[PDB]
Amino acid sequence: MAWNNIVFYSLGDVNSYQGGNVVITQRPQFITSWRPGIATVTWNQCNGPEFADGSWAYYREYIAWVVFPKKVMTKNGYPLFIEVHNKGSWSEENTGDNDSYFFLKGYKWDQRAFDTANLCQKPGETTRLTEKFDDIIFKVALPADLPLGDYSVTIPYTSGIQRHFASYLGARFKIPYNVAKTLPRENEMLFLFKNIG
Ligand SMILES: COc1ccc(O[C@@H]2O[C@H](CO)[C@H](O[C@H]3O[C@H](CO)[C@H](O)[C@H](O)[C@H]3O)[C@H](O)[C@H]2O)cc1
């Protein structure tokens, strides 16, 4: 019987961007950099073997994801609008979604392999991801009615790699956008600024 195992390895690190003194007519800008490191399984869908013992062939399809909010609320209830300025080589998909950007990079497909492998790691299991992907540059638009004062806004987002192992050549699977949208947002960028006059 044909099988497909798909596992999402999630990266999770914290960083900050200090925007300094800002006026509502200006657009602060920050860069989201892909940070190789320890990833945690946060989702899977499997109906195949859990381990490949090196004696039989399977096929690999890997797709990196970044799911980033289009709007983030301040603690006092004002929207900050996140706008993509430079997506690099990323594929920007499902553009009609009102709440989140979906950036994908499918970099391996239809690759036959016999290497021993953990084909269906469980949520909570970890592994090192050494792959590097392109930066994404964002700009922020502040609402003109934003009250003056100090702002600290946590911008949570998801980044990670979907690994799909299959028993057959030509296998394709993309995590549904409605599932990707709700994957845990384990990365955080803390955006600090002061709205002045
Ligand atoms: C055998 O003929 C092929 C024609 C075109 C192909 O396209 C490649 O498919 C890959 C499948 O994993 C991968 O596409 C995935 O990722 C894209 C984002 O980078 C996008 O989301 C696609 O919808 C997704 O399927 C490569 O990027 C394509 O160039 C493969 C074989």
Side-chain angles (χ1 to χ4, degrees):
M1 187 198 263
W3 54 262
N4 304 78
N5 289 352
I6 305 99
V7 184
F8 187 75
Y9 293 90
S10 180
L11 294 163
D13 226 309
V14 176
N15 76 314
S16 60
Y17 177 63
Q18 306 227 5
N21 293 305
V22 178
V23 294
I24 57 81
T25 49
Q26 89 185 67
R27 302 291 191 259
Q29 183 182 101
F30 63 88
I31 303 194
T32 298
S33 291
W34 178 276
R35 197 193 307 212
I38 298 156
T40 306
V41 176
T42 60
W43 180 92
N44 73 23
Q45 178 188 295
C46 302
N47 65 1
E50 297 188 319
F51 182 64
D53 68 2
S55 64
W56 53 271
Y58 56 92
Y59 296 81
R60 299 168 174 147
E61 179 192 36
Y62 297 166
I63 305 179
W65 288 79
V66 175
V67 185
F68 208 92
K70 294 185 161 178
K71 186 186 283 180
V72 186
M73 299 305 291
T74 63
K75 291 276 176 184
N76 59 352
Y78 289 81
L80 302 192
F81 298 86
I82 308 296
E83 302 165 337
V84 186
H85 177 60
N86 188 328
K87 69 176 141 79
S89 64
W90 290 101
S91 179
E92 182 177 342
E93 300 183 14
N94 192 36
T95 66
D97 191 276
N98 303 322
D99 310 291
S100 304
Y101 288 111
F102 299 86
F103 299 100
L104 282 79
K105 178 56 53 171
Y107 64 98
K108 185 180 292 302
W109 57 93
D110 293 339
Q111 185 180 75
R112 190 172 186 244
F114 285 83
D115 306 278
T116 52
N118 298 312
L119 302 180
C120 188
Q121 299 188 277
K122 298 174 193 164
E125 290 198 83
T126 62
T127 198
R128 180 168 296 281
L129 290 189
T130 55
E131 288 99 324
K132 176 66 174 182
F133 296 86
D134 214 356
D135 295 331
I136 302 168
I137 303 177
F138 294 101
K139 285 186 176 185
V140 178
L142 310 182
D145 56 323
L146 187 69
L148 297 179
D150 304 286
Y151 286 87
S152 162
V153 184
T154 294
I155 302 168
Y157 64 98
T158 297
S159 71
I161 299 175
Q162 172 199 306
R163 292 186 174 165
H164 168 206
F165 305 103
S167 59
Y168 62 97
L169 174 65
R172 296 283 179 277
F173 183 93
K174 182 186 289 180
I175 290 168
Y177 301 116
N178 70 25
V179 169
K181 198 183 180 173
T182 62
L183 286 168
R185 290 169 169 200
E186 305 189 316
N187 295 301
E188 289 177 5
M189 191 194 72
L190 180 70
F191 177 34
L192 299 188
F193 65 94
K194 185 174 183 173
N195 180 18
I196 65 157

Coordinates of all heavy atoms in Angstrom, one line a residue, residues 66-115:
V66 N 7.5 30.1 6.2 CA 7.5 31.2 7.2 C 6.0 31.7 7.1 O 5.5 32.0 6.1 CB 8.4 32.4 6.9 CG1 8.2 33.5 7.9 CG2 9.9 32.0 6.9
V67 N 5.3 31.7 8.3 CA 3.9 32.2 8.4 C 4.0 33.4 9.3 O 4.4 33.3 10.5 CB 2.9 31.1 8.9 CG1 1.5 31.7 8.8 CG2 3.1 29.9 8.0
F68 N 3.7 34.6 8.8 CA 4.0 35.8 9.5 C 2.7 36.7 9.5 O 2.0 36.8 8.5 CB 5.1 36.6 8.7 CG 5.9 37.5 9.6 CD1 7.1 37.1 10.1 CD2 5.5 38.8 9.9 CE1 7.8 37.9 11.0 CE2 6.2 39.6 10.7 CZ 7.4 39.2 11.3
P69 N 2.4 37.3 10.7 CA 1.1 38.1 10.7 C 1.2 39.4 9.9 O 2.2 40.0 9.7 CB 1.1 38.5 12.2 CG 2.5 38.5 12.7 CD 3.1 37.3 12.0
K70 N 0.0 39.7 9.3 CA -0.2 41.0 8.5 C -0.5 42.1 9.5 O -0.4 43.3 9.0 CB -1.3 40.8 7.5 CG -0.9 39.8 6.4 CD -2.0 39.7 5.3 CE -1.4 39.1 4.1 NZ -2.3 39.0 2.9
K71 N -0.9 41.9 10.7 CA -1.3 42.9 11.7 C -1.0 42.4 13.0 O -1.2 41.2 13.3 CB -2.8 43.1 11.5 CG -3.4 44.3 12.3 CD -4.9 44.4 12.2 CE -5.4 45.0 10.9 NZ -6.9 45.0 10.8
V72 N -0.5 43.2 13.9 CA -0.2 42.9 15.3 C -0.8 44.0 16.2 O -0.5 45.2 15.9 CB 1.3 42.7 15.5 CG1 1.5 42.2 17.0 CG2 1.9 41.8 14.5
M73 N -1.6 43.6 17.2 CA -2.2 44.6 18.1 C -1.2 45.1 19.2 O -0.5 44.3 19.8 CB -3.5 44.1 18.7 CG -4.5 43.7 17.7 SD -5.1 44.9 16.6 CE -5.9 46.0 17.7
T74 N -1.2 46.4 19.5 CA -0.4 46.9 20.6 C -1.2 46.6 21.9 O -2.4 46.3 21.9 CB -0.3 48.4 20.5 OG1 -1.6 49.0 20.6 CG2 0.4 48.9 19.2
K75 N -0.5 46.7 23.1 CA -1.1 46.4 24.3 C -2.3 47.3 24.6 O -3.3 46.9 25.3 CB -0.1 46.4 25.5 CG 0.9 45.2 25.4 CD 0.3 43.9 26.1 CE 1.3 42.8 25.9 NZ 0.8 41.5 26.4
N76 N -2.3 48.6 24.1 CA -3.4 49.5 24.3 C -4.5 49.5 23.2 O -5.4 50.4 23.1 CB -2.9 50.9 24.5 CG -2.1 51.5 23.4 OD1 -1.7 50.8 22.5 ND2 -1.7 52.8 23.5
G77 N -4.5 48.4 22.3 CA -5.5 48.1 21.4 C -5.5 48.8 20.0 O -6.6 49.1 19.4
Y78 N -4.3 49.1 19.5 CA -4.1 49.7 18.2 C -3.4 48.7 17.2 O -2.6 48.0 17.6 CB -3.3 51.0 18.3 CG -4.1 52.1 19.0 CD1 -4.2 52.1 20.4 CD2 -4.9 53.0 18.3 CE1 -5.1 53.1 21.0 CE2 -5.7 54.0 18.9 CZ -5.8 54.0 20.3 OH -6.6 54.9 20.9
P79 N -3.9 48.7 15.9 CA -3.3 47.8 15.0 C -2.0 48.4 14.4 O -2.0 49.5 14.0 CB -4.3 47.7 13.8 CG -5.0 49.1 13.9 CD -5.0 49.5 15.3
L80 N -0.9 47.5 14.3 CA 0.3 47.9 13.6 C 0.3 47.0 12.3 O 0.0 45.8 12.4 CB 1.6 47.6 14.4 CG 1.7 48.2 15.7 CD1 3.2 48.1 16.2 CD2 1.4 49.8 15.7
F81 N 0.5 47.6 11.1 CA 0.3 46.9 9.9 C 1.6 46.5 9.4 O 2.6 47.3 9.4 CB -0.4 47.8 8.8 CG -1.8 48.2 9.3 CD1 -2.0 49.3 10.1 CD2 -2.9 47.4 8.9 CE1 -3.3 49.6 10.5 CE2 -4.2 47.8 9.3 CZ -4.4 48.9 10.1
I82 N 1.8 45.2 9.1 CA 3.1 44.6 8.6 C 3.0 44.5 7.1 O 2.1 43.8 6.6 CB 3.3 43.2 9.3 CG1 3.2 43.3 10.9 CG2 4.7 42.6 8.8 CD1 4.2 44.2 11.5
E83 N 4.0 45.1 6.4 CA 3.9 45.0 5.0 C 5.2 44.4 4.4 O 6.3 44.8 4.9 CB 3.6 46.4 4.4 CG 2.3 47.0 4.9 CD 2.0 48.5 4.8 OE1 3.0 49.3 4.7 OE2 0.8 48.8 4.9
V84 N 5.1 43.5 3.5 CA 6.3 42.9 2.9 C 7.0 43.9 2.0 O 6.3 44.4 1.1 CB 6.1 41.5 2.2 CG1 7.4 40.9 1.8 CG2 5.3 40.6 3.1
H85 N 8.3 44.1 2.2 CA 9.0 45.0 1.4 C 9.9 44.3 0.4 O 10.1 44.7 -0.8 CB 9.9 45.9 2.3 CG 10.8 46.9 1.5 ND1 10.3 47.8 0.6 CD2 12.1 47.0 1.5 CE1 11.3 48.5 0.2 NE2 12.4 48.0 0.6
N86 N 10.5 43.2 0.9 CA 11.4 42.4 0.0 C 11.4 40.9 0.5 O 11.9 40.6 1.6 CB 12.9 42.9 0.0 CG 13.8 42.2 -1.0 OD1 13.6 41.1 -1.4 ND2 14.8 43.0 -1.5
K87 N 10.7 40.1 -0.3 CA 10.6 38.7 0.0 C 11.7 37.8 -0.5 O 11.6 36.5 -0.4 CB 9.2 38.2 -0.5 CG 9.0 38.1 -2.0 CD 7.7 37.5 -2.4 CE 7.1 38.2 -3.6 NZ 7.7 37.7 -4.9
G88 N 12.7 38.3 -1.2 CA 13.8 37.5 -1.7 C 13.3 36.4 -2.6 O 12.4 36.7 -3.4
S89 N 13.7 35.2 -2.5 CA 13.3 34.1 -3.4 C 12.1 33.4 -2.9 O 11.6 32.5 -3.6 CB 14.5 33.1 -3.5 OG 14.7 32.5 -2.2
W90 N 11.5 33.8 -1.8 CA 10.3 33.1 -1.2 C 9.1 33.2 -2.1 O 8.9 34.2 -2.8 CB 10.0 33.7 0.1 CG 11.0 33.4 1.2 CD1 11.9 34.2 1.7 CD2 11.0 32.2 2.1 NE1 12.6 33.6 2.8 CE2 12.1 32.4 3.0 CE3 10.2 31.0 2.1 CZ2 12.3 31.4 4.0 CZ3 10.5 30.1 3.1 CH2 11.6 30.3 4.0
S91 N 8.3 32.1 -2.1 CA 7.1 32.1 -2.8 C 6.0 32.6 -1.9 O 5.7 32.0 -0.9 CB 6.8 30.7 -3.3 OG 5.5 30.6 -4.0
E92 N 5.4 33.8 -2.2 CA 4.3 34.4 -1.4 C 3.0 33.9 -1.9 O 2.6 34.1 -3.0 CB 4.4 35.9 -1.4 CG 3.4 36.6 -0.5 CD 3.6 38.1 -0.5 OE1 4.6 38.6 -0.9 OE2 2.6 38.8 0.0
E93 N 2.3 33.1 -1.0 CA 1.1 32.3 -1.4 C -0.1 32.6 -0.6 O 0.0 33.3 0.5 CB 1.4 30.8 -1.4 CG 2.6 30.4 -2.3 CD 2.9 29.0 -2.3 OE1 2.1 28.2 -1.9 OE2 4.0 28.6 -2.9
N94 N -1.3 32.2 -1.1 CA -2.6 32.4 -0.4 C -2.7 33.9 0.0 O -3.0 34.2 1.2 CB -2.6 31.5 0.8 CG -4.0 31.4 1.4 OD1 -5.0 31.5 0.7 ND2 -4.1 31.3 2.7
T95 N -2.5 34.8 -1.0 CA -2.4 36.3 -0.7 C -3.7 36.9 -0.3 O -3.7 38.0 0.2 CB -1.7 37.0 -1.9 OG1 -2.6 36.9 -3.0 CG2 -0.3 36.4 -2.2
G96 N -4.8 36.2 -0.5 CA -6.1 36.6 -0.1 C -6.4 36.6 1.4 O -7.4 37.2 1.9
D97 N -5.6 35.8 2.1 CA -5.8 35.7 3.6 C -5.6 37.1 4.2 O -4.7 37.8 3.9 CB -4.8 34.7 4.2 CG -5.1 34.3 5.6 OD1 -4.8 35.1 6.6 OD2 -5.9 33.4 5.8
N98 N -6.6 37.4 5.1 CA -6.6 38.7 5.8 C -5.6 38.9 6.9 O -5.4 40.0 7.3 CB -8.0 38.9 6.3 CG -9.2 38.8 5.3 OD1 -9.1 39.3 4.2 ND2 -10.4 38.4 5.8
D99 N -5.2 37.7 7.5 CA -4.4 37.8 8.7 C -3.0 37.5 8.7 O -2.2 37.9 9.5 CB -5.1 36.9 9.8 CG -6.6 37.0 9.9 OD1 -7.0 38.1 10.4 OD2 -7.3 36.2 9.4
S100 N -2.6 36.6 7.7 CA -1.2 36.1 7.7 C -0.6 36.0 6.3 O -1.4 35.8 5.4 CB -1.1 34.7 8.3 OG -1.7 34.7 9.6
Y101 N 0.7 36.2 6.2 CA 1.5 36.0 5.0 C 1.9 34.5 5.1 O 2.2 34.0 6.2 CB 2.8 36.8 5.1 CG 2.6 38.3 4.8 CD1 2.8 39.2 5.8 CD2 2.2 38.8 3.5 CE1 2.6 40.6 5.6 CE2 2.0 40.1 3.3 CZ 2.2 41.0 4.3 OH 2.0 42.4 4.1
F102 N 2.0 33.9 3.9 CA 2.5 32.5 3.8 C 3.6 32.6 2.8 O 3.4 32.9 1.6 CB 1.4 31.6 3.3 CG 0.2 31.5 4.2 CD1 -0.8 32.5 4.1 CD2 0.1 30.6 5.2 CE1 -1.9 32.5 4.9 CE2 -1.0 30.5 6.0 CZ -2.0 31.5 5.9
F103 N 4.9 32.3 3.3 CA 6.1 32.2 2.4 C 6.5 30.8 2.4 O 6.7 30.2 3.4 CB 7.2 33.1 3.0 CG 6.8 34.6 3.1 CD1 6.4 35.1 4.3 CD2 6.8 35.4 2.0 CE1 6.1 36.4 4.4 CE2 6.4 36.7 2.1 CZ 6.0 37.2 3.3
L104 N 6.8 30.3 1.1 CA 7.2 28.9 1.0 C 8.4 28.8 0.2 O 8.6 29.6 -0.7 CB 6.1 28.0 0.3 CG 4.9 27.6 1.2 CD1 3.9 28.8 1.4 CD2 4.1 26.6 0.6
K105 N 9.3 27.7 0.4 CA 10.3 27.5 -0.5 C 10.5 25.9 -0.6 O 11.0 25.3 0.3 CB 11.7 28.1 -0.1 CG 12.8 27.8 -1.0 CD 12.6 28.1 -2.5 CE 12.2 29.5 -2.8 NZ 12.1 29.8 -4.3
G106 N 10.0 25.4 -1.7 CA 10.1 24.0 -2.0 C 11.4 23.7 -2.7 O 11.5 24.1 -3.8
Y107 N 12.4 23.1 -2.0 CA 13.8 23.0 -2.5 C 14.2 21.6 -2.8 O 15.4 21.3 -3.2 CB 14.7 23.7 -1.5 CG 14.7 23.1 -0.1 CD1 15.8 22.2 0.2 CD2 13.8 23.3 0.8 CE1 15.8 21.6 1.5 CE2 13.8 22.8 2.1 CZ 14.8 21.9 2.4 OH 14.9 21.4 3.7
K108 N 13.4 20.6 -2.5 CA 13.7 19.2 -2.7 C 12.4 18.4 -3.1 O 11.4 18.6 -2.3 CB 14.3 18.5 -1.5 CG 14.8 17.1 -1.7 CD 15.4 16.5 -0.4 CE 16.7 17.2 0.0 NZ 17.8 17.1 -1.1
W109 N 12.4 17.6 -4.1 CA 11.3 16.8 -4.5 C 11.7 15.6 -5.3 O 12.7 15.7 -5.9 CB 10.3 17.7 -5.3 CG 10.8 18.3 -6.6 CD1 10.8 17.7 -7.8 CD2 11.6 19.5 -6.7 NE1 11.4 18.6 -8.7 CE2 11.9 19.7 -8.1 CE3 12.0 20.5 -5.8 CZ2 12.6 20.8 -8.5 CZ3 12.7 21.6 -6.3 CH2 13.0 21.7 -7.6
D110 N 10.8 14.6 -5.2 CA 11.1 13.4 -6.0 C 12.4 12.7 -5.8 O 12.9 12.1 -6.8 CB 10.9 13.7 -7.5 CG 9.4 14.1 -7.8 OD1 8.5 13.7 -7.1 OD2 9.2 14.8 -8.8
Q111 N 13.1 13.0 -4.7 CA 14.4 12.4 -4.4 C 14.4 11.1 -3.8 O 14.0 10.9 -2.6 CB 15.2 13.4 -3.6 CG 16.7 13.0 -3.5 CD 17.5 13.9 -2.7 OE1 17.4 14.0 -1.5 NE2 18.2 14.8 -3.4
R112 N 14.8 10.1 -4.5 CA 14.8 8.7 -4.0 C 16.0 8.6 -3.0 O 17.1 9.1 -3.3 CB 15.0 7.7 -5.2 CG 14.8 6.3 -4.8 CD 14.8 5.4 -6.1 NE 14.5 4.0 -5.8 CZ 15.3 3.0 -6.0 NH1 16.5 3.2 -6.4 NH2 14.9 1.8 -5.7
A113 N 15.8 7.9 -1.9 CA 16.9 7.7 -0.9 C 16.7 6.4 -0.2 O 15.6 5.9 0.0 CB 16.8 8.9 0.0
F114 N 17.8 5.8 0.2 CA 17.8 4.6 1.1 C 18.3 4.9 2.5 O 18.3 4.1 3.3 CB 18.8 3.5 0.5 CG 18.2 2.8 -0.7 CD1 18.4 3.4 -2.0 CD2 17.6 1.6 -0.6 CE1 17.9 2.7 -3.1 CE2 17.1 0.9 -1.8 CZ 17.3 1.5 -3.0
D115 N 18.9 6.2 2.7 CA 19.5 6.5 4.0 C 18.6 6.2 5.2 O 17.4 6.4 5.2 CB 19.8 8.0 4.1 CG 20.6 8.5 2.9 OD1 21.9 8.3 2.9 OD2 20.0 8.9 1.9

